[PDB]
Ligand binder design. Sequence first.
Ligand SMILES: Nc1ncnc2c1ncn2[C@@H]1O[C@H](COP(=O)(O)OP(=O)(O)OP(=O)(O)O)[C@@H](O)[C@H]1O
Ligand SMILES: [Mg+2]
Lengths: 16, 268
Amino acid sequence: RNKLRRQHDYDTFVDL
Amino acid sequence: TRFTEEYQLFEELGKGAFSVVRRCVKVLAGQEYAAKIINTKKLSARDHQKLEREARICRLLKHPNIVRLHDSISEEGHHYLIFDLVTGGELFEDIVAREYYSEADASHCIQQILEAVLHCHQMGVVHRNLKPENLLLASKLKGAAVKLADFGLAIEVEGEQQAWFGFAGTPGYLSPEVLRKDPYGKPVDLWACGVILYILLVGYPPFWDEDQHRLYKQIKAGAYDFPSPEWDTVTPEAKDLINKMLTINPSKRITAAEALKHPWISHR
Ligand SMILES: Nc1ncnc2c1ncn2[C@@H]1O[C@H](COP(=O)(O)OP(=O)(O)OP(=O)(O)O)[C@@H](O)[C@H]1O
Ligand SMILES: [Mg+2]
């Protein structure tokens, strides 16, 4: 299944 | 100035990069709060203006399901934010611990989240960054209230006017309109509510991929499943509310007001 992970906030478009 | 003389500091509750939060007492009232103590000397001009916008926006909000900012003080080398003391940790942690919520508990939880979002929207505030990490349980007690926090990315909107407010938020909870670079507003929060509600019911999100390009394609296409077996026992009106929140056209998306009248919530 999809992973429940802590995710970070971004102030701008940052291409990962 | 007035912080050190009106508030008595007690023990450290947590820390971030440029902040320490301690339990404090407003000496006159004897009421306890959380004091977020920010070293403003270690902040860029940008971070300093972010902080003062956050303080302004949070002060607009007065709701039992929003972490109340009671006071904002800018002293010598420090900024003090006086918040509701919350001792129950993040909704993220509680979901992880309990795996997932019963429809009763999930419905009760999202109702509180929707009341907070509705209040935000009525005050002309869009959060833009709703997620389990940004919802806090008031206490460890059985029926502790969920409280919305972190207005660091919140914006002020003019009534029902949409605009391009920029690419900001948490990738997994970003709305299709933000990914499409469309003008947006209040509906972005209702998309995130859909992602949160999905997580409450099965303990995993509707959109995930290690490749961020593919994650953003899934969200823009609104490509999510209700897989078997876990979703087989989930009631159709629960799935209906999720579907009505996770519509890729924000004009066709259920509002916070409409969501609170939805059978699965209003008949619970
Ligand atoms: N209202 C509160 N009551 C009790 N403890 C709190 C409260 N707010 C925050 N804390 C504790 O302090 C920690 C750090 O607070 P916070 O996340 O606001 O700081 P930060 O990480 O510097 O800020 P930001 O998240 O905006 O970057 C939290 O993880 C939590 O343990
Ligand atoms: Mg933090």
